[PDB]
């Protein structure tokens, strides 16, 4: 209630320090948790050496950056990421192999995976900009054919979601646990599973309030998405030459 800015700026930085990667937020995160915390399931269907690599897999790594402008209508999708595929496809979109990033080197060598997720969607918007976005997670997007009529902010507001206001420039934390029909997702081509490899559903960022401003205001803003794999477990140690690149999309 009594402001006194100095050379530092009178703020309070919140830190997310996860395995030598530190994320900083000026604002408070707007969290939303779709499902409760999952259990480890190496008991029921694995006899191979099952081990996470928490020093290299529970790190933060950007998977998407995009430009939200004022030339977007009311109900318009900005991002639609199939996150376990989107990590590998964001690496392959930077034109290299998957063995050059320490986050994804167990995906090259193992066969199956189960772990929870942490998604940070950070906007960099001016204080005078006005707008609002959704951060809605949907489990198993491709297994529903009527999802093309579902992708709208009217339907995504009904399930739980994270709101991002362009004025406050706040942040969206997304605790995504593993919830799938099968208790493991294969990383490569595996028997009677040829398509939809390592797909758990779509994080899709759409617009509620389009970006509004004055006549000479800053036209665009930037949105960056980071991901974390914290409660992982990798089973089925295999050859890396069996692995193939992801579908481009």
């Amino acid at each position: 209630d009594n402001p006194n800015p100095g050379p530092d700026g009178e703020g309070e930085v919140e830190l997310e320090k996860d395995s030598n990667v530190v994320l900083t937020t000026q604002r408070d995160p707007s969290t939303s948790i779709p499902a409760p915390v999952s259990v480890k399931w190496s008991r029921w269907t694995s006899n191979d050496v099952v081990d996470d690599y928490a020093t290299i897999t529970s790190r933060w790594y950007q998977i998407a950056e995009f430009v939200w402008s004022k030339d977007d209508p009311f109900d318009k999708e900005l991002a639609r990421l199939i996150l376990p595929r989107a990590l590998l496809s964001s690496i392959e979109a930077n034109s290299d192999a998957i063995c050059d990033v320490p986050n994804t080197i167990p995906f090259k060598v193992h066969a199956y995976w189960r772990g929870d997720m942490e998604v940070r969607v950070q906007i960099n918007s001016n204080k005078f900009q006005v707008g609002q976005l959704q951060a809605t997670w949907y489990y198993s997007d491709h297994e529903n054919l009527n999802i093309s009529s579902k992708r709208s902010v009217y339907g995504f507001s009904q399930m739980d979601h994270a709101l991002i206001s362009a004025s406050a420039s706040n942040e969206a934390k997304l605790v995504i646990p593993f919830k799938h029909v099968y208790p493991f997702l294969p990383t490569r081509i595996v028997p009677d599973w040829t398509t939809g490899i390592l797909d758990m559903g779509a994080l899709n960022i759409r617009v509620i309030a389009p970006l509004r401003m004055s006549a000479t205001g800053p036209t665009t803003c930037n949105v960056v998405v980071f991901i974390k794999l914290n409660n992982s477990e990798f089973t089925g140690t295999s050859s890396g030459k069996f692995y193939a690149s992801q579908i481009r999309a």
């Binding site: 694995s46 066969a111 493991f184 081509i189 040829t194 069996f242």
Partner: protein, 205 residues
């Protein structure tokens, strides 16, 4: 009458000739990590008969299986034959990955190297690695859109070739026995995918 007492009995499924001129890394057998392992009889009937392990016969009646399998390798050799081989195990492979296989890609996955000096028998217990707690059986009740391959694939290459002495033979028989291990179990009863050979007569419509 107990399924864990039937599947705990070894059945001879394979014989493999391992010779002196087999080079370093030659394939002896590749097969499927399932109870449905076949041995075809070379008969003249229009429908062919097959030998199965008792675990495969008792698993044909049930839809879903899970657990470890135990492959007993009995290598019929003297105490003057010397060799060394890998019994490896690769987690899930498709049909296009059944080829492009050597003894070097095998050592990325789980594998066991066995030396043959004086003990001529061992038992490899097979891991159960899948995305699914159970596993749907290999054949259907004559419903061809219900076919499903193995969860994973077993190999047996030659790590060190055979060195026999000049007084013994240059060829060695290897028997492969199958029984469902201590963790093997089956659940849902369906129409069994196998039939008896008592009346081996089929009528085309």
């Amino acid at each position: 009458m107990t399924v864990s007492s039937i599947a705990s009995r070894y059945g001879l499924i394979r014989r493999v000739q391992w010779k002196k001129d087999h080079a370093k890394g030659s394939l002896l057998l590749q097969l499927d990590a399932d109870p449905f392992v076949e041995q075809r009889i070379e008969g003249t009937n229009p429908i062919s008969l097959y030998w199965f392990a008792p675990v495969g016969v008792v698993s044909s009646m049930f839809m879903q299986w899970r657990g470890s399998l135990e492959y007993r390798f009995d290598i019929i050799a003297s105490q003057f034959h010397t060799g060394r081989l890998i019994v490896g195990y690769v987690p899930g492979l498709t049909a296009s990955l059944q080829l492009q296989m050597d003894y070097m890609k095998l050592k990325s996955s789980s594998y066991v190297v066995f030396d043959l000096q004086e003990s001529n028998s061992f038992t490899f217990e097979v891991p159960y690695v899948s995305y699914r707690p159970w596993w749907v059986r290999k054949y259907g009740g004559n419903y061809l859109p219900s076919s499903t391959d193995a969860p994973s694939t077993l190999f047996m290459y030659v790590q060190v070739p055979l060195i026999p002495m000049e007084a013994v033979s240059d060829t060695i028989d290897i028997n492969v026995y199958v029984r469902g291990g201590s963790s093997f179990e089956v659940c849902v009863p369906v129409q069994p995918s196998l039939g008896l050979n008592w009346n081996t007569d089929f009528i085309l419509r």
